């Protein structure tokens, strides 16, 4: 079951999971993008530093909700709202970041 | 029900609700205009708090751990949601700092 587009990245920003709703939103299949860097894949070049700064704070233990402009496979610009969360593993340590897209645009 | 404090962009208190009076043990009248970080953040943690507490931009919300100290000097390990307050021209004019009743791990995502 999937409520929304969701992507998981490790602490460097490389993709570790990419759900079916993400396949539809961004127009890549999971196999095409596994291991690729999310910010390089979909964030427009002038916005990468800002996106990376957010991800760095999230990986250190904060939750973020905000405007997230990204580039679909077909080169449409998406003005999304995303919820970014640290992901905890079984050992209760931060292992990555969740990037989930909300149903309203900014 | 939710403790909420508003600050201006100097870090000084502009709003303090009844729930904040109960959480932190101060009344609105005595804290209005006071610097929030000097009021409730332990000395060792202030630069850290300042480093982030003023950094919220337009169209984002930050949720994170926030160590504070009550009037009685009990240490509180809290979580706060920080959002910008916009003026009539949609410029940031302040920051809203509202307490969540959870520790951070209860808000995080999980791998199984």
């Amino acid at each position: 079951f999937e409520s929304q587009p969701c992507v998981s990245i490790d602490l460097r920003g490389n993709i570790t999971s990419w759900n079916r709703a993400a396949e539809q939103l961004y127009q890549f299949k999971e196999g095409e993008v596994m291991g690729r860097n999310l910010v390089d894949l979909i964030v427009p070049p002038n916005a990468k530093t800002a996106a990376l700064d957010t991800i760095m704070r999230v990986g250190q233990g904060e939750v973020w909700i905000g405007q997230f402009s990204c580039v679909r496979r077909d080169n449409a610009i998406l003005n999304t709202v995303v919820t970014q969360k640290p992901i905890l593993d079984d050992d209760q340590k931060i292992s990555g970041i969740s990037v989930c897209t909300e149903p309203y645009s900014m």
Side-chain angles (χ1 to χ4, degrees), chain A:
Chain A
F1 160 89
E2 294 181 7
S3 82
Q4 67 191 136
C6 285
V7 179
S8 293
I9 53 178
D10 66 20
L11 292 176
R12 302 151 172 188
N14 303 321
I15 293 161
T16 60
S17 86
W18 174 284
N19 76 2
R20 286 166 269 210
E23 299 182 329
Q24 293 316 124
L25 176 68
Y26 301 123
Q27 304 179 340
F28 298 96
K29 292 294 198 182
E30 183 169 50
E32 301 189 85
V33 299
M34 193 55 58
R36 294 185 71 100
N37 187 269
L38 184 64
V39 166
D40 289 326
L41 184 67
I42 65 173
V43 172
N46 71 320
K48 298 188 174 177
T49 293
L52 288 164
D53 284 342
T54 299
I55 281 158
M56 190 181 287
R57 284 176 68 170
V58 178
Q60 293 305 130
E62 286 176 278
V63 169
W64 183 79
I65 311 95
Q67 202 277 314
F68 188 83
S69 287
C70 49
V71 183
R72 200 162 67 176
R73 181 195 219 130
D74 73 348
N75 290 323
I77 304 309
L78 312 183
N79 291 325
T80 71
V81 172
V82 304
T83 301
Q84 298 187 3
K85 296 191 174 196
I87 303 170
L88 293 175
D89 60 38
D90 288 335
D91 304 334
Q92 306 301 308
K93 303 180 187 188
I94 294 166
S95 62
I97 291 145
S98 189
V99 183
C100 292
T101 303
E102 304 310 326
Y104 53 90
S105 292
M106 186 64 81

